[PDB]
Amino acid sequence: SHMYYSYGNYEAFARPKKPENVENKSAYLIGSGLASLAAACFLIRDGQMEGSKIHILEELPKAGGSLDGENMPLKGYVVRGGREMENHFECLWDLFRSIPSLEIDNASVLDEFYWLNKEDPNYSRCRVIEKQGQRLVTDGDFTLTKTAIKEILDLCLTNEEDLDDVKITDVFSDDFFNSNFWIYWKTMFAFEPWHSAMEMRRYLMRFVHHISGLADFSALKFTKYNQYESLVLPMVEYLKSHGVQFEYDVKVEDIKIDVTTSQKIAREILIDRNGNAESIKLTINDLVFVTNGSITESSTYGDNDTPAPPTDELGGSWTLWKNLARQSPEFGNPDKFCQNIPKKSWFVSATSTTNNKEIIDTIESICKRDPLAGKTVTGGIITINDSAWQMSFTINRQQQFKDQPENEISTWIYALYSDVNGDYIKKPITECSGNEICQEWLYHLGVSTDKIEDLAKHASNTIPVYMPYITSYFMTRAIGDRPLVVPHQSQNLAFIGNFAETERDTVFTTEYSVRTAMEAVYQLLNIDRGIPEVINSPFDLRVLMDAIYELNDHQDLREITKDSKMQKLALAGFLKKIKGTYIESLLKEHKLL
Amino acid sequence: SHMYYSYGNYEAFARPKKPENVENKSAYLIGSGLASLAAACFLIRDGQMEGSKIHILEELPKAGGSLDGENMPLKGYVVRGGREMENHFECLWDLFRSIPSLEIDNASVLDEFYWLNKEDPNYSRCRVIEKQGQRLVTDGDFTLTKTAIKEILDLCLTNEEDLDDVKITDVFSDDFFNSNFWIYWKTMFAFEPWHSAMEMRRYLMRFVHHISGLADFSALKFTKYNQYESLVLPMVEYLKSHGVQFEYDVKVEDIKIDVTTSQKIAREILIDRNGNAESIKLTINDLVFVTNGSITESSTYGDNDTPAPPTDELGGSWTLWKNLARQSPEFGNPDKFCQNIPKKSWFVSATSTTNNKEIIDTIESICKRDPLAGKTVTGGIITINDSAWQMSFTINRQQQFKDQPENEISTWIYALYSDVNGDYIKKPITECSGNEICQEWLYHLGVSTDKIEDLAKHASNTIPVYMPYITSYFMTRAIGDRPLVVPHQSQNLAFIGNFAETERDTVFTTEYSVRTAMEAVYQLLNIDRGIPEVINSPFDLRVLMDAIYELNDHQDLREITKDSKMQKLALAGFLKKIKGTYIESLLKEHKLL
Ligand SMILES: Cc1cc2nc3c(=O)[nH]c(=O)nc-3n(C[C@H](O)[C@H](O)[C@H](O)COP(=O)(O)OP(=O)(O)OC[C@H]3O[C@@H](n4cnc5c(N)ncnc54)[C@H](O)[C@@H]3O)c2cc1C
Ligand SMILES: Cc1cc2nc3c(=O)[nH]c(=O)nc-3n(C[C@H](O)[C@H](O)[C@H](O)COP(=O)(O)OP(=O)(O)OC[C@H]3O[C@@H](n4cnc5c(N)ncnc54)[C@H](O)[C@@H]3O)c2cc1C
């Protein structure tokens, strides 16, 4: 193609030559989420494109998209969701080592993040609770049977090309869905049983190097504040310092694209700049980066006394992608992702803010840390295993908002099941006000029922959010439902974000938006530098040995095959062949012998 | 330990916090070769130690050590040797992305190197010649038998701990030593048959990712000029710009070190600053970095009419290490490396400089490129397979010296066998003047015998070098013959360079001197940043598949087991199990099916 994949320090530390003819080129980016902001950064840093020639078109009043986090007027503090990150976000760390921190002088976002997560390393002291505040007895074990582990491996051993439209329930049976592994997995990643087995396979291979840090979240890393303040604003400042044009309340309705037998060229961007319909006409030297689709599109907000009103509106993002899909099948199949979403699916998240000491003290007694100490609190989500909603909640380092009073915590809450009565509040989450969500949560923390209503109604402000498309990334798909980052024969059109198509990597991650942004800029501008591949961990023998050990809850190879002689016989035969060799040493080194 | 290994961009791009109490610390570095210069750079950049507190002590009049390259007065142009490098010199590229280029403004040594090797990618058009100038018929094939390949794998499958004092001839039989593979291997890496099987195993695993670029040198990368001008001088300028003290003609005779039951502390450096004997007394906050041993120590130089005089002098480097070994067995076993070196071993290298058109035209006719064009010429060494000396020669990009006339080439020549009469000059190389080495070389290029003596004597200036210890890295060794980079309980003493002990990596490489330098600085100062591991290629399934394909001269798995039914039966059984799975896809992707 117009790019190549690499790994290692040589390509990481190298600077690309200024790409050819970039002086006569411009860039239009549809949306101002993380993908578009990352594409613009690469355009500045590695494309050496003029800032004033880069135009970011956003339909909302501000930037960031799904990376939001704000004190919403007449409502309260809101996080549409948190962001778990990890060391092997290979592209995203390439980007943010070049973004100046807004807190620490002469340091980058990576530096401040790197130091913070060493000062205050993330881990969970309590991962799963049940029976109104009691820690799950087996918390920390995966409780996978040998049958469940085999299905996990059969899935990874399945070609991606054979998982078209296959569901997670099509490839796993009873034992797996009964495991603690599935509890940790489905909740930390927001998988539903009807979601894409293809994506879940991508996930099993993508984070295999962190399976030992799965139950305790010790592989997770977190920014200092919410992702708007810690990621979006550093990017915007950097971009603004280079003269990049930001255009808000501009809704891209369509892009007219010539798809001939030899070329795809974007010709005109049909926009609605606040009520009025206008156009931007393009040449071949005007590059268009489309964030196609969005999980946060058409979001509604409730308040402490009002449910967030459910909706099925196709907003601008999904109507744009549909209008583009009308012009070539190579531009993807939006309806696979925005249509026929089950009403059981996750729709609602809520931010519960309180300074009340009974609430805060109850959270301390479950998570074993002071929620107001300024460090890790829950270390990630706590899952209420036996909750009807399949609800989970987390308290990040407090306060997640620079402007927030230092005696308040904000708790983020979400529910995997949206069409089921709660256990204390006898309604589905979609039917619930802020305070009713809070009440159902407080009940599962063991708060005395005598106090739940008053603590929720009067000692807390809880803002709910209804997101019709929050599960849209994971909908069952076929190869081809997502456009290439640079479709075949495209001259000036790229698709970026978590609905574009690239190899191996996992969607529902910020890394995917930076990778697609990076690959699009590199291909359209023919930048002469490698793109870091998705980390090679599933091909690494040492990581595969570790995974066998971890998946079998820390049993060596003799314990594993202990009670099946057909496999035990082969082990003895295997050990005869490898005794006194380097394979026996590696296996011992990774606790398999 | 006081360090950890990592890989990936997160650790690569991160900056370490200023280490604790570094303000009250100093550094003494014994030698000014690449290791010491690299240790000082890391001390400046990542240790944030004051430059004026860093003291580099060198016995020679200038810096660089084995990285030399100069117009030696009354002699001629000399390169003690070239430097093949590769992309996965993980530590060295970490270092040199921080070293400013002396040619390109606002660019680093890595940048200029990275760009140059893309502008002018290295490859050989002619790797092995014989019969006075004819290309080897099988050049490009490895001509390994299945028996030779099995021995290669049995070696890698042997624990390092079981190769103590084992020779290369102890683990390989006839077929291997008859292969083209061994021709390429022994000459590009300067292995002798009596050298350490342990190191050769380390080499097989270390560069397994480049086995496809072995015969044509397409994996090699080269600096613009000789390594003194392109590597040493950029470092010195950087170091000097930070106030580092350089001390020349200072010979370190001994370091007094307290080795107690609980600590090793260096107390005093006994020096000879030009004739006079002096001392430097140390506290625990004075760090000492010892480059122990040297392959270039005690080098003698001839000229066009005089042999370089053979020697067996222990110079300052080997006497220093012996004096240190007298103080603890934990400081290594110098005699394994500087004593009992076979007289057949490589001792002599020579730089032949000429502007003569018959010589230059003859080289063009073998290497197929214009030697004076300013780009790649031989792409690496050309090996004269049927030469009694087992001689090889290379012409790098010309001119290798910024000051050299643009109508001259310099050819670097070396011989693996030092005690055998040449085929045209009937003497061992050690007995030969500059011009006699040149004459023997010219004969193997097909130069008409009528012209050889005059072209060598009068149309060329050839400077020979006698290096008693040039093969010293590869001498058979046991675990323990080399000190840890930071010996157990050392407080202020580290050993650096290619005679120190670290995991997996290969000596006779510049990467090893930067890695040992990096690890020593990081351990003694407790720098809070990862050290990049030796590249994980021998654990990568995809690289192991490629190696099977390449080692079997590009045969798939059916061709390989074609004529052994005991293995063919197992293949059929293997293929039954994996058909329609992702393993079958990977194998096809890597040409094994
Ligand atoms: C609740 C939640 C939790 C998450 N947790 C994690 C996590 O733990 N770890 C992780 O790695 N990732 C997480 N993510 C994912 C990450 O936040 C998203 O993947 C990422 O922000 C996607 O960014 P994007 O730029 O690709 O698109 P989006 O974030 O969806 O942004 C699209 C933007 O474009 C604008 N736009 C859309 N259509 C149009 C149009 N037609 N015209 C003009 N403008 C338009 C929108 O206004 C929006 O600003 C989470 C996301 C959510 C919602
Ligand atoms: C001919 C040749 C070809 C090579 N080719 C390659 C190649 O292709 N690729 C590759 O990666 N590497 C190659 N190398 C290796 C690389 O050049 C060396 O590994 C590297 O330079 C070692 O540096 P060092 O600092 O570890 O020690 P040295 O280079 O040996 O330097 C030691 C220095 O310390 C000084 N010193 C020694 N003892 C004392 C003392 N007692 N007191 C004071 N000062 C002292 C010496 O004067 C010298 O300057 C080659 C080396 C040679 C000789």
Author numbering:
A (entry chain C), B (entry chain C): -1 to 591
Would you copy out the relevant sentences from the publication that reported this structure?
Flavin adenine dinucleotide (FAD)-dependent bacterial oleate hydratases (OhyAs) catalyze the addition of water to isolated fatty acid carbon–carbon double bonds. We conclude that OhyA accelerates acid-catalyzed alkene hydration by positioning the fatty acid double bond to attack the active site hydronium ion, followed by the addition of water to the transient carbocation intermediate.
The OhyA•PEG400•FAD substrate analog complex shows a hydrogen bond network in the electron density surrounding the buried active site water that is consistent with a hydronium ion. The substrate water is the focus of a hydrogen bond network that includes the Glu82 side chain, the backbone carbonyl of Met186 from the α7 helix dipole, and the hydroxyl of PEG400. The contiguous electron density around the substrate water reflects the strength of the hydrogen bonds and leads to the conclusion that a buried hydronium ion is created at the active site. Curling the substrate around the hydronium ion positions the 9-carbon of the hydrocarbon chain within 2.8 Å of the substrate water. When FAD binds, the catalytic Loop conformation is altered by its direct interaction with FAD, and the Glu82 sidechain is repositioned to form hydrogen bonds with the substrate water. An overlay of these two states shows how FAD displaces the nearby water molecules and rotates Glu82 into a catalytic active conformation connected to a single substrate water molecule. Comparison of the positions of PEG400, oleate, and h18:0 product shows that PEG400 is a nonreactive substrate analog that adopts the same curled conformation in the active site as the substrate and product.
